Structure formats: C-alpha cells, structure tokens
Amino acid sequence: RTFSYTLEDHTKQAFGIMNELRLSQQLCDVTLQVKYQDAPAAQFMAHKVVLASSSPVFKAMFTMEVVSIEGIHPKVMERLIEFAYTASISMGEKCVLHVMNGAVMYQIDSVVRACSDFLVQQL
Amino acid sequence: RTFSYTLEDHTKQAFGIMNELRLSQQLCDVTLQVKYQDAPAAQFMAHKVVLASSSPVFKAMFTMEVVSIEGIHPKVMERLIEFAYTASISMGEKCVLHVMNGAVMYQIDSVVRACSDFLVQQL
Ligand SMILES: *[C@H]1C(C#N)=C(O)[C@@H](C)[C@@H]2CCc3c(OC)nc(C)nc3[C@@]12C
Ligand SMILES: *[C@H]1C(C#N)=C(O)[C@@H](C)[C@@H]2CCc3c(OC)nc(C)nc3[C@@]12C
C-alpha cells in the first residue's frame, strides 16, 4: 500500500508568498524597464520563472537581467505582472482595450479572452 | 466603473509549467546536493522562489548556488520538492514516518499534519 496526499490551495498559498517576495524585491532575477510614449519610465522587478509560467512570450525570452520593454504602457505591464502573481486583474472600464493589447502582446490568453468577452458585451 | 477578472486554476496551471521547467532544468538557480548514510549521492535542480514559497526553512536559506544537504534521505527530498511544484506527495505506507521527518525538517506543515494524521490512525 502507498499513502498519497494533496493540498488543495497550496498553489494559491505559494503564489501569495511568491507575490510577497516580489513586493519585498527578494530572489528577483529580472528587472523590466518599461518606456512608452509620453508616460514616465518605470521599473518592475520579478522572477523569470513566475512570468515564464504565465506568458509563452516571457517563457521564450528567458529560455539579474535588465530587459527594455517598448510598445506597452507601464500601468498595463504592472497589471499583467500582478495577474501572473495573483491570478487576478482589474482595470477601469475605459481601458479594457489597452489591457487586452498588452495581454495579446504577451500571449496571456485568459486575460485576452476575458477582455474580448467583455468588449463584445459592450456592444 | 472598473472591470475585474480572476482565473481560477491559473496558479495550478502556472505550477504545471514551473514543474515542466524544473524537469527540463531551465531557469534553475539552486542545485541541492544530498548526501545521507549508505544511500548514494543525488542532485536536484530547482528554483529558489518555488521552494521558498513552500518552505519557511528554504525561504530563510535564500533571503546558480550549490547547497549541501545532510540528515535527509535523497528520495525524501525528491518527494518534498515534487510536493512544492505539484501540491501532491505519495510514499509507501512503511515510509510515512521518514517523509514526516523531512517535512518537519523543512517546516512543510501540511505534509507534517497529513503524515501525523495518518500515523495516528495506524494505531
Ligand atoms: C486607463 C485605466 C483606467 N481607467 C486603467 O485602469 C489603466 C490600466 C490604464 C493604463 C493604460 C492607459 C493608457 O495607455 C495608453 N491610456 C490611457 C488614456 N489610460 C490608461 C489607463 C490609465
Ligand atoms: C520507503 C518508501 C517506501 N515504500 C518510500 O516511498 C520512500 C519515500 C522512502 C525514502 C526513504 C527511505 C529510507 O530512508 C532512511 N529508508 C528506507 C528503508 N526506505 C525508504 C523509502 C524508500
């Protein structure tokens, strides 16, 4: 006989700690330098493996590093990184399209679908 | 108004990819060198942030690095790393105690409790 065990919300709890570590800027191996039209420059520290596990684009990119990012608004990038680390994303009704464009850019299909589904309803 | 969205099994899916990356030995930043009485030496590559998010002991340790580990059987370490990356652990009925001792050593309380609860029933 063999004993087997599964903790249901382990992944959720471990992501909570992973998110904590990102805010404390601990164990981070990538710094995203985001520049975009008009908007001020911004830096976001993260863990390559966490981003990679949420975005095929990020996974391709990585398989301390400073990465220059263009063509995406810093606040959009912020919301997508937050999604990677928390499984949740929120945005103002009037910017749903902008977030979708970032999501499409980094192939985060669930966010893409969600924004699309919402925008279809808005007409 | 603000749009908000949550993907339920995102963390589970992202851990699946994180587990994939570990097996492919990609993005890894720690190599655990495990030596124990009689048993042959073993190496385990992992991501510091993933272990850290499952074990307070690992979190303390980290906040490519080779780490020497003693006092724990390699197959026990293997099962705990697998738990960190999959939320699931299995062991032969006759070794539940050994896994518990590793779990206690690395303060993975859910595994500890599970093994304890099972061993209490076994008497
Ligand atoms: C619109 C908005 C609202 N309300 C948000 O929730 C964030 C996510 C948006 C960031 C991107 C953006 C851009 O990018 C070009 N332009 C405008 C006019 N507004 C937004 C935000 C602030
Ligand atoms: C016992 C066992 C079974 N059946 C397992 O499932 C694994 C996890 C054990 C690893 C540790 C261990 C030790 O460690 C000192 N000693 C013995 C005799 N057996 C085990 C395993 C193989």
Short mmCIF file of N, CA and C in Angstrom, two decimals, chain B residues 32-78:
data_model
loop_
_atom_site.label_atom_id
_atom_site.label_comp_id
_atom_site.label_asym_id
_atom_site.label_seq_id
_atom_site.Cartn_x
_atom_site.Cartn_y
_atom_site.Cartn_z
N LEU B 32 20.60 21.27 -5.29
CA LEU B 32 20.65 20.63 -3.98
C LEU B 32 21.46 19.33 -4.07
N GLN B 33 22.60 19.31 -3.40
CA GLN B 33 23.44 18.12 -3.32
C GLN B 33 23.16 17.39 -2.02
N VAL B 34 22.51 16.23 -2.14
CA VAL B 34 22.02 15.50 -0.98
C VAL B 34 22.87 14.26 -0.69
N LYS B 35 23.47 14.24 0.50
CA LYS B 35 24.22 13.09 0.98
C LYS B 35 23.67 12.58 2.31
N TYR B 36 23.59 11.26 2.42
CA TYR B 36 22.94 10.59 3.54
C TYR B 36 23.58 9.22 3.75
N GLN B 37 23.47 8.70 4.97
CA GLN B 37 24.04 7.40 5.35
C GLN B 37 23.70 6.29 4.35
N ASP B 38 24.73 5.54 3.94
CA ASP B 38 24.62 4.43 2.99
C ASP B 38 24.21 4.87 1.58
N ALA B 39 23.03 5.48 1.48
CA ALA B 39 22.41 5.89 0.20
C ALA B 39 23.33 6.72 -0.70
N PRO B 40 23.27 6.48 -2.03
CA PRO B 40 24.10 7.20 -2.99
C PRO B 40 23.78 8.69 -3.06
N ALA B 41 24.76 9.48 -3.48
CA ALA B 41 24.60 10.92 -3.62
C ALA B 41 23.63 11.25 -4.75
N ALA B 42 22.91 12.36 -4.60
CA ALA B 42 21.93 12.79 -5.60
C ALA B 42 21.91 14.31 -5.74
N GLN B 43 21.60 14.77 -6.95
CA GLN B 43 21.46 16.20 -7.24
C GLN B 43 20.04 16.53 -7.67
N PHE B 44 19.53 17.65 -7.18
CA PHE B 44 18.20 18.12 -7.56
C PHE B 44 18.28 19.60 -7.91
N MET B 45 17.94 19.92 -9.15
CA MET B 45 17.88 21.31 -9.58
C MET B 45 16.47 21.85 -9.39
N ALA B 46 16.38 23.09 -8.89
CA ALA B 46 15.11 23.72 -8.61
C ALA B 46 15.22 25.24 -8.71
N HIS B 47 14.11 25.91 -8.44
CA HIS B 47 14.05 27.37 -8.41
C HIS B 47 13.86 27.81 -7.00
N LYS B 48 14.75 28.69 -6.54
CA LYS B 48 14.74 29.16 -5.15
C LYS B 48 13.38 29.68 -4.72
N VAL B 49 12.75 30.47 -5.59
CA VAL B 49 11.47 31.12 -5.28
C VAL B 49 10.33 30.11 -5.09
N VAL B 50 10.38 29.00 -5.82
CA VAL B 50 9.35 27.96 -5.71
C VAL B 50 9.49 27.20 -4.39
N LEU B 51 10.72 26.82 -4.05
CA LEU B 51 10.98 26.15 -2.77
C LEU B 51 10.65 27.09 -1.62
N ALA B 52 11.14 28.33 -1.72
CA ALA B 52 10.91 29.37 -0.72
C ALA B 52 9.44 29.60 -0.43
N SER B 53 8.59 29.43 -1.44
CA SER B 53 7.15 29.65 -1.30
C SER B 53 6.42 28.43 -0.73
N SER B 54 7.18 27.38 -0.42
CA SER B 54 6.61 26.16 0.14
C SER B 54 7.19 25.84 1.50
N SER B 55 8.42 26.30 1.73
CA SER B 55 9.14 26.02 2.97
C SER B 55 9.77 27.28 3.56
N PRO B 56 9.38 27.62 4.81
CA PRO B 56 9.97 28.73 5.55
C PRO B 56 11.46 28.53 5.77
N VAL B 57 11.88 27.28 5.91
CA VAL B 57 13.30 26.93 6.01
C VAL B 57 14.05 27.34 4.74
N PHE B 58 13.51 26.95 3.59
CA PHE B 58 14.08 27.34 2.30
C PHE B 58 14.05 28.85 2.11
N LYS B 59 12.94 29.47 2.50
CA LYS B 59 12.79 30.92 2.41
C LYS B 59 13.88 31.65 3.20
N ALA B 60 14.16 31.17 4.41
CA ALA B 60 15.23 31.70 5.25
C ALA B 60 16.60 31.51 4.60
N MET B 61 16.81 30.33 4.01
CA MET B 61 18.08 29.97 3.37
C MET B 61 18.46 30.89 2.21
N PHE B 62 17.47 31.35 1.46
CA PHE B 62 17.73 32.09 0.22
C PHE B 62 17.59 33.61 0.33
N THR B 63 17.00 34.10 1.42
CA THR B 63 16.79 35.55 1.59
C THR B 63 17.81 36.22 2.51
N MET B 64 23.54 30.47 -10.11
CA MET B 64 23.49 29.08 -9.64
C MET B 64 24.21 28.89 -8.30
N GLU B 65 23.46 28.44 -7.30
CA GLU B 65 24.01 28.12 -5.98
C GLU B 65 23.94 26.62 -5.70
N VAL B 66 25.06 26.07 -5.26
CA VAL B 66 25.13 24.68 -4.83
C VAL B 66 24.93 24.63 -3.31
N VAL B 67 23.96 23.84 -2.87
CA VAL B 67 23.68 23.67 -1.45
C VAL B 67 23.90 22.22 -1.05
N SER B 68 24.75 21.99 -0.05
CA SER B 68 24.94 20.67 0.53
C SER B 68 23.87 20.38 1.57
N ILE B 69 23.16 19.27 1.41
CA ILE B 69 22.14 18.85 2.37
C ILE B 69 22.52 17.51 3.00
N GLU B 70 22.42 17.47 4.33
CA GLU B 70 22.69 16.26 5.10
C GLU B 70 21.53 15.99 6.04
N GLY B 71 21.45 14.75 6.52
CA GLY B 71 20.44 14.37 7.51
C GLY B 71 19.07 14.07 6.93
N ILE B 72 18.98 14.05 5.60
CA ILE B 72 17.74 13.70 4.92
C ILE B 72 18.01 12.79 3.72
N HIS B 73 17.23 11.72 3.61
CA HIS B 73 17.34 10.77 2.50
C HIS B 73 16.97 11.40 1.18
N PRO B 74 17.78 11.17 0.13
CA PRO B 74 17.56 11.80 -1.17
C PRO B 74 16.15 11.62 -1.73
N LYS B 75 15.58 10.43 -1.56
CA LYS B 75 14.24 10.12 -2.05
C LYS B 75 13.17 10.89 -1.28
N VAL B 76 13.45 11.21 -0.02
CA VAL B 76 12.57 12.05 0.80
C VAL B 76 12.59 13.49 0.28
N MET B 77 13.79 14.00 0.00
CA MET B 77 13.95 15.34 -0.56
C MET B 77 13.24 15.46 -1.90
N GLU B 78 13.43 14.44 -2.75
CA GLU B 78 12.75 14.33 -4.04
C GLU B 78 11.24 14.49 -3.91
#
